[PDB]
Amino acid sequence: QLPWVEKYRPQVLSDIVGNKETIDRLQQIAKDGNMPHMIISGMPGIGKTTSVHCLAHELLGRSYADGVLELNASDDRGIDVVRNQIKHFAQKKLHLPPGKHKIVILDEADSMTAGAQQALRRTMELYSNSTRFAFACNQSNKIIEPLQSRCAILRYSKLSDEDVLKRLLQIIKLEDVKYTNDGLEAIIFTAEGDMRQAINNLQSTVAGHGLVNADNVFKIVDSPHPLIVKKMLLASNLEDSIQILRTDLWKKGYSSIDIVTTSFRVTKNLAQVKESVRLEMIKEIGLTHMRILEGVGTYLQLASMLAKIHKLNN
Template identity: 70%
Template sequence: MSSSSAAKGKAPANGNAANLPNYELPWYSRYLISGGMPGIGKTTSIHCLAHQLLGDGYKEGVLELNASDERGIDVVRNKIKSFAQKKVTLPPGRHKIVILDEADSMTAGAQQALRRTMEIYANTTRFALACNMSNKIIEPIQSRCAILRYSKLRDQEVLKRLLEICEMEKVEYSNEGLEALIFTAEGDMRQAINNLQSTWSGFGFVSGDNVFKVCDQPHPITVQAMIRACLKGDIEGAMDKLDELWDQGYSAVDIVVTIFRVVKTFDEYVHL
């Protein structure tokens, strides 16, 4: 996020910044859009980059706003503009950074105002936008940004982090509990960690049944049994499982969504 005209070979302003790499980006990559589903590390990645670039100047040199809460044009005109005008001491060749989370929630007017602000303060401030759908960002902003598209996390990546947390926090769990956390998270690390904490706080043990109680989702084993009964032509058995789900209070949408997710886990290719 440094300017292409950043000075080379100069001593850093402080000791901790001495080891910072001297990033040189072309003009079209001075701004960043990270897009993808929630809970996969978009905003965290931007914060890590800001820490790496600014060192001790991170606290003073970064402004973070959640655009879903502060989405109007006044935010751009007041908060962002004031921050861009503020003088901050940073390592040589570094710039202030504005992080806009949920940027796709900004109104069209606010995005137009942001585009103009990005142009005016290009020499002092860099902008990093995190969003779920980058196509909701207006084209003039997209054309000024390097766009990074994040894919959802793989099950093994979610499992690795959950195991680390369970070990550090002394959480008791079963393998079925971890599988349930991964199933309910759907690649969303934030959701997986939240479900882990809620299950541990509520039950003191992370099992499959406890996880599905916390998440209030149809148990995939019940749904799987219903589908298997259908495949065997056992309509009565399938209806019994469906009635069981109805009695537990699940809606048709909950059941259908879980059916599709369970079918994806089948070894054989099942057509519904």
Template identity: 70%
Template sequence: MSTGTKVTLELPWVEKYRPYKLQDIVGNEETVERLKIIAKDGNMPNMIISGLPGIGKTTSVHCLAHELLGEYYHQATLELNASDDRGIDVVRNKIKQFAQTKIVLPPGRHKIIILDEADSMTPGAQQALRRTMEIYSNSTRFAFACNQSSKIIEPLQSRCAILRYNKLADEEVLARLLEIAKMEEVKYNSEGLQALIFTAEGDMRQAINNLQSTVAGFGFVNDVNVFKIVDQPHPLVIQNILLSCVKDKDLDKAMELLDSLWSKGYSAIDIVTSTFKVAKTIPDINEQTRLDVIKEIGFVHMRILEGVSTYLQLCGMYAKICDI
């Protein structure tokens, strides 16, 4: 039934605020400077950009392509993602076909093939690319974006310039979140922004998505709402558990707080992951104690990942931390 209201399709903020110029990219200044020099000279090499998810690898390649190709960007760029089938057939057909296509470009410019999540390409497909890269080197350049460059075969690595992206600093993520919050007129408090940064761990894409989800779900960005949206245990509760163990040696109090988290439905992996994050910044303990605590968490984390995901593992972990 129509209510007569007009429905407007809103872009996800992560797309709405995606940079289109290299100067707008946040973080990794040294690497981005190298890309700016490439854009200025116009001679792009084949390249591999590696780093963690959500820190701007693919966006950087698109920005570079925009600056190099200008109005020819759409017809002279081919992007293939991990979601596409990228076996040998795709290399032989799609990629080769695009490389063979005649497109009139300004002097010194090349067609660009962007292979996102390149480390999930089959070794056979990577081998098939070797010859294609050499045959069409006069007209086409390849850009591989991947999380681990070691999963790209050696012959391809030797044909490419390798750029590495580091995790974004908390201040860089915060600055971008504040910009978006201002443009979208988001209501927030400082605890809410801290929670977004804590949960994103240097991943800009996740930080922006969590910001939008919290605004859509609750209208106000504070720490409680953010942790509900990302479905992680509140770090203050985890911090209280650790302080009860390390400082007060009060295992009963720690178990009460653990029970409150367990009854809310958090899994063992949620709790142990958050415990590790909080242990790195827990206040007023000496570094040796901190290292011993992290070591215990590491052992339990390993057991949980191997499949022993039980409440008893968590109880044992906190009991051992009490003994430190």
């Protein structure tokens, strides 16, 4: 057994799909060599760590094992570490090509305490001749102001649907698996931009049910079927919606958070109703979501949400 996400992980900078201008910027950086300190921010599962890894690889060639220091969340990153080890690595001697430099890749930089982030300031400022820092964070807000001022900020947009679709087409072509278009559409709907989660769900579907079909996807994801949620939200009589929520969703043991999230994600794609009604239904659904997240996930809240949605649609 082998996770398809790891097996088909991009190793060259060109294999990464999605953002085009930032990938082109990184390509020009790897072609030139003068790479500055950079923070990379974005949503989870969109190719941040892979980007900096392929960048360092293409930059250092046969020197990745000597001039690259990677620190993820599983390693100790305190004050003692950033004071001793990072400083001793920045001062290391290494004969590199005239364009290349050493690389310190700090992943999940938002988890590093402020006291540890304060010490890196002069360490990364004084040794700018043989050391360039690359942070990979989910939130660019937990990084202190001096660090944000020093290094350039690079935001990664969420993945669109055509890019994930092309990546999945490449994967299934190189894997020789049977599929149907509605199955790919279900994968796109469930992934909501997470390329890693998309590949993982596709591999799980292929390994469990063989044929990639919407029924098997919605069975393996263990989430409320979008069709039944659409039927519940678009019903005419409120009693019908309440009965559907009672006997189909609430009885099977679905979590209220899952119900609300599926209703949100289905109302977003309901292209039959107008735009204002969609926005207001999403507003009520989000109000119910915030109410549930505050400790009260009672069925009464979902009933009131359905009542408000029916009153709005009428």
